[PDB]
Design an enzyme around this catalytic site. Structure first.
Site, PDB file in Angstrom:
ATOM      1  N   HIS A 158      -1.548   2.396  11.148  1.00 21.64           N
ATOM      2  CA  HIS A 158      -2.209   3.139  10.052  1.00 21.64           C
ATOM      3  C   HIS A 158      -2.799   2.275   8.951  1.00 21.64           C
ATOM      4  O   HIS A 158      -3.831   2.638   8.395  1.00 21.64           O
ATOM      5  CB  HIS A 158      -1.277   4.200   9.475  1.00 21.64           C
ATOM      6  N   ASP A 159      -2.178   1.130   8.650  1.00 17.84           N
ATOM      7  CA  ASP A 159      -2.655   0.253   7.573  1.00 17.84           C
ATOM      8  C   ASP A 159      -3.439  -1.018   7.943  1.00 17.84           C
ATOM      9  O   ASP A 159      -3.602  -1.891   7.077  1.00 17.84           O
ATOM     10  CB  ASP A 159      -1.487  -0.198   6.708  1.00 17.84           C
ATOM     11  N   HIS A 206      -4.287   9.045   6.720  1.00 20.62           N
ATOM     12  CA  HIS A 206      -2.878   8.987   6.319  1.00 20.62           C
ATOM     13  C   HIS A 206      -2.566   9.100   4.828  1.00 20.62           C
ATOM     14  O   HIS A 206      -1.393   9.251   4.464  1.00 20.62           O
ATOM     15  CB  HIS A 206      -2.168   7.788   6.962  1.00 20.62           C
ATOM     16  N   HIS A 207      -3.581   9.010   3.959  1.00 17.32           N
ATOM     17  CA  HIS A 207      -3.404   9.272   2.520  1.00 17.32           C
ATOM     18  C   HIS A 207      -4.030  10.575   2.076  1.00 17.32           C
ATOM     19  O   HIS A 207      -4.025  10.899   0.884  1.00 17.32           O
ATOM     20  CB  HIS A 207      -3.902   8.134   1.646  1.00 17.32           C
ATOM     21  N   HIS A 260      -9.110   0.886   2.457  1.00 13.65           N
ATOM     22  CA  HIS A 260      -8.367   0.414   3.622  1.00 13.65           C
ATOM     23  C   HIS A 260      -8.277   1.476   4.679  1.00 13.65           C
ATOM     24  O   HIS A 260      -8.089   1.188   5.849  1.00 13.65           O
ATOM     25  CB  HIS A 260      -6.989  -0.132   3.266  1.00 13.65           C
ATOM     26  N   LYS A 268      -6.149  -3.044   5.848  1.00 14.55           N
ATOM     27  CA  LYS A 268      -5.853  -3.978   4.766  1.00 14.55           C
ATOM     28  C   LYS A 268      -6.364  -5.391   5.014  1.00 14.55           C
ATOM     29  O   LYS A 268      -6.616  -6.125   4.051  1.00 14.55           O
ATOM     30  CB  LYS A 268      -4.382  -3.979   4.425  1.00 14.55           C
ATOM     31  N   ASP A 282       5.311   8.124   6.845  1.00 18.77           N
ATOM     32  CA  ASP A 282       5.035   6.945   6.050  1.00 18.77           C
ATOM     33  C   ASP A 282       5.704   7.097   4.683  1.00 18.77           C
ATOM     34  O   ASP A 282       6.433   6.193   4.197  1.00 18.77           O
ATOM     35  CB  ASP A 282       3.526   6.814   5.877  1.00 18.77           C
TER      36      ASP A 282
END
Ligand SMILES: Nc1nc2c(ncn2[C@@H]2O[C@H](COP(=O)(O)O)[C@@H](O)[C@H]2O)c(=O)[nH]1
Ligand SMILES: [Fe+3]
Ligand SMILES: [Fe+3]
Ligand SMILES: [Fe+3]
Ligand SMILES: [Fe+3]
Ligand SMILES: [Fe+3]
Lengths: 363, 361
Positions: A224-225, A279-280, A253, A228, A308
């Site tokens: 998911h990240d 995801h955010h 990101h 970055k 998360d």
């Protein structure tokens, strides 16, 4: 009257079962049952070899552990080392026969037929043994032929199961390590990347998704990240809190992760891409980067937010000790229908104990 | 001696259990069915969500033939899920006689049954043709074909599942390897090609086919350590000074740190390549100045492949070197930059390399 094709049809059906079975233990079990029936024998055993403990091993009952067997003794032992077939007409006239297991249980071993198993490269990987022919006094030349063919089939399906496991493990390994390529510039841990997938797995399972999608989120969510990697150091490496120019960049990101992952055709990468970008987002519509609302976020994104956020709250982070279960439950009850999918929040709350045992076992 | 067919079946299913390629699995199944049903011909038809047709492959390994999912015998079985047992094709209106017409074949009996997946959807048709009695397919035949069909579904689904895993595994390594795309110019295709070259190099060097597959997949990850290099170095607009170059060189160590300890063989090899791919055969490379076989073979094969791709790509003011110029360079660098023995293999095969660079540009 008898069906002339009866054993053929039995064998087809066993072959379907085995083709579907990923668990080696069950593969072995089925191959054993198949041998008893096709060979018309009372007992069968497969013995495989362990590099590390230097022994042969077998499964005795369904659902119980490996029995260690000496790789140099007995009928199995001889066949394993020599590569040659043994056909014993009377086990008690044979000095290589262990009379003990036979004499502790009230069982009588008369006939034994044992042949080796070979891998692709013609090495001996174990033994296939049948005991007590039921419909004849001895095992015949024809029996030997049949068992050799059975043995070839056993070897292949056994190897195919090992390889499929190795490939599965390697696939996970690669996803896990590469996802953690952010390790030099971001504090999130290897185990965080793994656990997020594990929580989402529970969630997808208990939400009734197909077995395949359960496996997908388990592997997609960890990534998911990844975006970055595309954030400037001045924003990613900034101690403490962040201004509202830098924040606008940090938000990106999500977009960047999508960019990295979208260029697949596999279902895995389409899902992982979605998760990276979603995801955010909040069930609300008050998240970023687009303020998507409700079902506008894919279920995989929704399941990942929950996982998360859960993992973050339960670890030490700057200024803040890990939350306990009780406080965690309070927070999720509060945020049900806001930050998070209300349906998925209930599932998650029902299963909070496994969530925590995962967090406990994988620090 | 009714154990003839048992032994035939165990031989086929041994071959299938080993077979990684769906194409071949279908061929094995139709051959199996021919022998076991004692029939002259068999075909498997599978459905395609996208093009909305059935398809089948003929032996010899040609392309897939697309079939109308609505009309025909297989069409019928696919739509309805019913069994079709035709005693004489040339009397049945659903039969298209053109196949016989091209081949010099004469279809008489056709027996066709549905294929079902785990979830119980109709995914295809198994069809058996011209029973060797020259008479009808019997109720017992239909029953036998039903068990064959179940075995076929299982093996097909299991082969598709493996291809999807294989395909996902590649996608993931390719895409995440290009995670550097925002701060570094090396392309997605460059990342793929380097693996493709090394695959051929490893195979021709005599390596085990499973190891050949590993290098194809491990080599594309060698620059992943770039993600840990500070922007003030990787994104600097000037050329780097000495201090900055030393930091850039650490992308080898950084890749190792990212990849190591992963328990699988794939990642152990990938980690080595990451940290060794700038080492030079003569010991004048970085980060450690490793010499000869102190560099793992995988490291050695990746250096060769990486340089090859660079030399053969256009950059502004700097046109890709052609075959002759590239061959000359590898000759000059034998025993210096590169492993002499591996350079020879590579040279012997350089036409294959240029084809890859031509197909995946
Ligand atoms: N409400 C709240 N959320 C947190 C806290 N710590 C981390 N998070 C959540 O964690 C999410 C991302 O997880 P992380 O990046 O820490 O793995 C953020 O979007 C944020 O909502 C906290 O103390 N309170
Ligand atoms: Fe994030
Ligand atoms: Fe995060
Ligand atoms: Fe490079
Ligand atoms: Fe490099
Ligand atoms: Fe490169």
């Amino acid at each position: 009257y008898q069906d002339p094709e009866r054993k053929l049809k039995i064998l087809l059906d066993y072959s379907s079962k085995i083709a579907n079975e990923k668990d080696l233990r069950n593969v072995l079990l089925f191959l054993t049952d198949l041998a008893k029936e096709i060979m018309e024998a009372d007992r069968a055993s497969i013995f495989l070899y362990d590099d590390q403990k230097k022994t042969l091993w077998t499964i005795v009952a369904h659902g119980v552990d490996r029995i260690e067997i000496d790789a140099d003794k007995g009928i199995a032992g001889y066949v394993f080392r020599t590569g040659e077939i043994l056909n014993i007409p009377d086990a008690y006239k044979d000095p290589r026969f262990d009379r003990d297991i036979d004499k502790r249980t009230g069982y009588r071993t008369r006939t034994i037929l044992a042949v080796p198993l070979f891998d692709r490269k013609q090495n001996i990987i174990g033994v296939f043994q049948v005991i007590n022919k039921l419909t004849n006094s001895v095992f015949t030349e024809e029996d030997i032929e049949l068992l050799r063919h059975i043995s070839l089939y056993a070897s292949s399906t056994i190897e195919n199961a090992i390889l499929y496991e190795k490939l599965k493990k390697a696939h996970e390994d690669v996803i896990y390590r590469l996802s953690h390529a952010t390790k030099f510039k971001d504090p999130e841990t290897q185990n965080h990347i793994i656990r997020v997938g594990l929580y989402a797995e529970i969630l997808a399972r208990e939400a009734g998704l197909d077995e395949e999608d359960v496996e997908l989120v388990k592997l997609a969510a960890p990534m998911h990240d990844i975006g970055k990697v595309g954030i400037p150091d001045r924003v990613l490496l900034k101690p403490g809190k962040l201004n509202d120019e830098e924040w606008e960049i940090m938000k990106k990101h999500t977009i960047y992760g999508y960019e990295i992952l979208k260029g697949g055709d596999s279902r895995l990468l389409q899902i992982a891409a979605d998760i990276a970008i979603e995801h955010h987002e909040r069930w609300d519509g008050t998240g970023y980067p687009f303020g998507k609302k409700g079902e506008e976020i894919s279920i995989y994104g929704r399941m990942t937010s929950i996982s998360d956020v859960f993992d973050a709250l339960t670890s030490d982070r700057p200024y803040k000790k890990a939350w306990d279960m009780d406080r965690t439950v309070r927070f999720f009850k509060e945020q049900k229908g806001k930050h998070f999918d209300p349906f998925l929040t209930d599932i998650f709350l029902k299963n909070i104990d496994q969530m925590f045992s995962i967090k406990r076992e994988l620090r």
